[PDB]
Design a binder for this molecule. Structure first.
Ligand code: GTA
Ligand code: 4IK
Ligand code: ZN
Ligand code: ZN
Lengths: 297, 113
């Protein structure tokens, strides 16, 4: 297993192309825990390896980059993931995070409440979601597509994600959405990434890369999640904290990616090509305005 | 004329044998950094640990107002460097100690001025 020195393992293309039936996910390493560096949280290690992997992809990194982080608060009351993001992202990058429960964050702005209440005027370059429903841990049924915050995320991506932008959305065996998988086909490239520290878990980050605003690929969500489960079942991943010990190359390289404002009729194959290569961002350059809806009763 | 003082409250708590505030967010870094007290990215040297600023702030963690007219926080949004020996209580360290203005280091720790 040479994968131990990588930040994690990404779902191989051949597994994406299959057609499989959804099975129960039984992991060989289930219950095992990676050995973390002294005094390091799981969430810090997990987010570190996620960013370390994102450095290997082609991401548009414009000046005044806009990143939004959903489900950033922990049960401890802090925001470990946000901290890693801020470290990783270029200095001056506007970072907004949100969670259902109150928490303390290093982000530029923090919204407390259900994600469905969150509204933003502008668009975003990068979207990160660690959101997980604890009620998913209770299985009273088969494993089917999940609504809730997954419904909001798909809407937020289609509406509020700038072209060329990227997303990382946390999923598990029982926490997943079919439309989110179908939405991955609206990106130039996509994968399911599993961190080496959390490898004992069915958890992965669905990663859209360079959003094209339209499907370049048709993806069945139910089939693809079955493919993901099949990959995890037949490919045990060795728990590794190894990549955490080299932080030298960690920060996200600032590419000064161009930001243009185009109508949807102005987007040609030439523009779509620039997007796919991570060399272009299409959105408004205006000021960032966010709000959280408050129900009165 | 009444104001709740947490600074004194936490200091006296520690002296009572109280368990220091935990779950401060420690960052993975090279530990090759400049070693300055408060910075935009983790600057920790070999002798330091780098933490998320907000998690080390007593006023942030206790959900109370900051001791100043503006209510500004010099921790949140930044990263603070705690000496490895004092790293067991990052909140207490930042509270008790002071940052040198000219060289940006901690007063008494790493400050040669
Ligand atoms: N996989 C899943 N299950 C069973 O399926 C149920 C739900 O399946 P899942 O979708 O939750 O997947 P999984 O168990 O892999 O998730 P995991 O607990 O590792 O959590 C992963 C991430 O979810 C988040 N998370 C987990 N629990 C919570 C929570 N209670 N609240 C908030 N976030 C949570 C955390 O960020 C965590 O890192 C589990 O309760 C378990 O009995 C398995 N059982 C066996 N025997 N072998 C397995 O391989 C297996
Ligand atoms: N342990 C994981 C945990 C924290 C992430 C990790 N600790 C981290 O560092 O980012 C996931 C977060 O998802 C939130 N969440 C779940 N459902 C919703 C929802 N519908 N709307 C908003 N937030 C939600 C929930 O409040 C929880 O704090
Ligand atoms: Zn503070
Ligand atoms: Zn000095």
């Amino acid at each position: 297993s040479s994968q131990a020195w990588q930040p994690g393992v990404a779902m191989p293309n051949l597994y994406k192309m299959q057609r499989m039936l959804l099975e129960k996910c039984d992991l060989q390493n289930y219950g095992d825990s990676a050995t973390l560096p002294k005094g390091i949280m799981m969430n810090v290690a997990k987010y570190t390896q996620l960013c370390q992997y994102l450095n290997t992809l082609t991401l548009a990194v414009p000046y005044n980059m806009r990143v939004i982080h959903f489900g950033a608060g922990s049960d401890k009351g802090v925001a470990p993931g946000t901290a890693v993001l801020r470290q990783w992202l270029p200095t001056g990058t506007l970072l907004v995070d949100s969670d259902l429960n109150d928490f303390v964050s290093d982000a530029d702005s923090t919204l407390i409440g259900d994600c469905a209440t969150v509204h933003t005027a502008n668009k975003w370059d990068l979207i990160i979601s660690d959101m997980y429903d604890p009620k998913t841990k209770n299985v009273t049924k088969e494993n089917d597509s999940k609504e809730g915050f997954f419904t909001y995320i798909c809407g937020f991506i289609q509406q509020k994600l700038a072209l060329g932008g990227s997303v990382a959305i946390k999923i598990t065996e029982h926490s997943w959405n079919a439309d989110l998988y179908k939405l991955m086909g609206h990106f130039a490239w996509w994968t399911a990434f599993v961190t080496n520290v959390n490898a004992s878990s069915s958890e992965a980050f669905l990663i859209g890369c360079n959003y094209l605003g339209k499907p370049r690929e048709q993806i069945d969500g139910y089939v693809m999640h079955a493919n993901y489960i099949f990959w995890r079942n037949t490919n045990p991943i060795q728990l590794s904290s190894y990549s955490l010990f080299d932080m030298s190359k960690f920060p996200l390289k600032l590419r000064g990616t161009a930001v243009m404002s185009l109508k949807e009729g102005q987007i040609n194959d030439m523009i779509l090509s620039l997007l796919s290569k991570g060399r272009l961002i299409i959105r408004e350059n205006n000021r960032v305005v966010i709000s959280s809806d408050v129900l009165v009763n | 004329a009444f104001a709740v003082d947490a600074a004194k409250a936490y200091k006296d708590y520690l002296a009572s044998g109280g368990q220091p505030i935990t779950n401060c967010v420690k960052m993975l870094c090279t530990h090759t950094g400049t070693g300055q007290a408060i910075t935009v990215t983790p600057e920790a040297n070999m002798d330091q640990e780098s933490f998320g600023g907000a998690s080390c702030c007593l006023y942030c963690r206790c959900h109370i107002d900051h001791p100043n007219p503006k209510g500004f926080c010099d921790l949140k949004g930044k990263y603070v460097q705690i000496p490895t020996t004092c790293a067991n209580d990052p909140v207490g360290f930042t509270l008790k100690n002071t940052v040198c203005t000219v060289c940006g280091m901690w007063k008494g720790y790493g400050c040669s001025c």
